Structures are given as C-alpha cells and as structure tokens.
Amino acid sequence: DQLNPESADLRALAKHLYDSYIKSFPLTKAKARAILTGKTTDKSPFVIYDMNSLMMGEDKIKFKHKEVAIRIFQGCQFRSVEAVQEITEYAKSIPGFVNLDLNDQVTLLKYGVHEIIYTMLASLMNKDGVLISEGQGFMTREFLKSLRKPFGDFMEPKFEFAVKFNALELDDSDLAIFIAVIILSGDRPGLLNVKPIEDIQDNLLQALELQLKLNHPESSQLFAKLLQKMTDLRQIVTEHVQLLQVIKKTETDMSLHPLLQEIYKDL
Ligand SMILES: CCO[C@@H](Cc1ccc(OCCn2c(C)ccc2-c2ccc(SC)cc2)cc1)C(=O)O
C-alpha cells in the first residue's frame, strides 16, 4: 500500500464504477438495508407472506407481468429480463468494455448476467425474505417454499448463498467493482480476443483488492473469499438452469421468456 499515481488511478476507477452503479441500479444495497431494518423514512414495503397477502399485494403493487405459483415464476423471469438491461447499461460504463469486439461484449454479458443477478439479489435478502419491485414489496422465504411442486425450490439456493454472502458485509462501493470483475471474465466460452478482456480484468482486480483493504480494515481474508464466491456463483447459475429443466420435464407447457431461452441455450 503506497500513495502513487497507480493507486490514485485505481481509486479513480473505483469511484467511476460506484457512480455508474448508482446510476444504473435503482435500489442500492445501502437503501435496501435501510428498508429491511425499517430505518428508512420511506413507506414500509407491502409484506407477502401467504396466499391472501400475495393477492392483496398484486392489487396494491403495479406488477408488470395463471395460478399463483406460475404467476410468481413468470414475475421472476420478467424481473430477470429487466435486470439484464440494467446490467448491460452498467457494463457500458466499465472503462474499455465498449472497445471490445461487440461479439465479445455480448458473450461476456450472456455468461455474466445471471451471476450478477444473484449477487445483487443478496443485497435485497435477509433470513426472512426478499425485497421486490424496487422495495415496494417483501416476499417471504417460507412463502416461496410453500409454492406447489415443482416450484417451491428454486429460490432456496439463492437465499442460502445470500446469507453467507451478506455475512461478508460488502457495501455498494465494494460491489460495484466486484460485479465489474465478474463481467470481464476471460474464460467465458467462445470469446474472440481473450487478452484485452484479461487486461481489463486484471486492472479491476487490482482496484478491488485496494478497495477491500481500505474499506475493511478488520478483514484481511476478504479478497480471497470474494474470489471463492465468484466460483460459487457459477455453480448457482448451473444448478438453476438444471432446476428449470426439471420444471419443464413435468410442466411441459411452461416456456421461458424467449430472451432467457437464448441466454440459457448454450449454457
Ligand atoms: C424463475 C426465473 O429465474 C430467473 C432468475 C431470477 C430468480 C428470482 C428473482 O427474483 C426477483 C424478485 N424481484 C425483485 C428483486 C424485483 C421484483 C421482483 C419480483 C416481483 C414480483 C414477483 S411475482 C408477484 C416476482 C419477482 C429474479 C431473477 C432466471 O432464470 O432468469
């Protein structure tokens, strides 16, 4: 750790990513945690904890998307497609990203967006449930587990991931760099020019390590633990696609949103 022009550049990169992240993502972790504790001055979210409150909340909240379990399943797909858009806008602000070959930009987003979705879902989760509709609702973990087979399973691994990930106590300034690192992964299948991606990622990794050393004086293991989480996330994505296939095997009339079908196609 020294104050030299390289470290000043790395702090400027971290600040740029934070400022962009705040612009691209409506509900930050900082705001989400204030809502979850009730410390916000905003109105409380509507809590969905059973079938009755699900129906009352659908009448209260403007959801942009059958029976209950299918409606929730579809609402998650619609949120996912929205999130793809937000993450794409964020990726355009990562220095160097839009100068990569446009096919590599697309490949990096295809293989990275779900890892980012699950990372940022953790910001909205506690032990009891998840904030939905940019904080207007809160849907409980046990209500999700109560949905009829084969729909009662798919959020559980995401809550399990979140409980452990949230224990690391990252803030938005940390997360903005972490999710840039994930997007700039040079080992995604089918990339045309790996070296320029790795060069960007190495710089982001340096910015992340410096940020974590400055921002978390009471951990020295945090960077290594975050590299571990990046591997965990790929397992969560794969397991989710497998879950979706199982659902399709028995609910053959289910269909994924066409954009998710393309992302999952060669995945
Ligand atoms: C099954 C598809 O899974 C997806 C991956 C996936 C899984 C869960 C998920 O939570 C989203 C929960 N949320 C948020 C954070 C805002 C609005 C909703 C919401 C509001 C209302 C409802 S229904 C009243 C549902 C959701 C987002 C993406 C994929 O494979 O791309």
Domain extent at residue 12: 1-267
Residue ranges at the known binding site for rosiglitazone: 77-80, 114, 240, 264
Please work out whether the CB of residue 75 comes within 6 Å of at least one atom of ligand 1. yes
> What are the phi and psi torsion angles at 83 (to 5°)?
-60, -35
Residue 9 has a CB neighbour count (10 Å cut-off) of 13
State the structure-solving technique: X-ray
Residue with CA at minimum distance from ligand 1 atom 26: 76
Please work out whether the CB of residue 76 comes within 6 Å of at least one atom of ligand 1. yes
What's the 3-state SS for 174-199? HHHHHHHHHHCCCCCCCCCCHHHHHH
Please work out whether the CB of residue 79 comes within 6 Å of at least one atom of ligand 1. yes
Domain count, the chain: 1
Please work out whether the CB of residue 133 comes within 6 Å of at least one atom of ligand 1. yes
Please work out whether the CB of residue 110 comes within 6 Å of at least one atom of ligand 1. no
DSSP the chain: ---SHHHHHHHHHHHHHHHHHHHH-SS-HHHHHHHHHT-SSSPPPEEE-SHHHHHHHHHHS------HHHHHHHHHHHHHHHHHHHHHHHHHTSTTGGGS-HHHHHHHHHHHHHHHHHHHHHHTEETTEEEETTTTEEEEHHHHHTSPTTSSSTTHHHHHHHHHHHTT---HHHHHHHHHHHHT-TTSTT-S-HHHHHHHHHHHHHHHHHHHHHH-TT-SSHHHHHHHHHHHHHHHHHHHHHHHHHHHHHSTT----HHHHHHHHT-
Residue ranges at the known binding site: 77-80, 114, 240, 264
Which of ligand 1's atoms lies nearest the C-alpha of 124? 15
Residue with CA at minimum distance from ligand 1 atom 12: 132
Please work out whether the CB of residue 113 comes within 6 Å of at least one atom of ligand 1. no
Residue with CA at minimum distance from ligand 1 atom 15: 132
Residue with CA at minimum distance from ligand 1 atom 9: 76
**Centroid of ligand 1 to alpha carbon of 112 (angstroms):** 17
Reported resolution, Å? 1.8
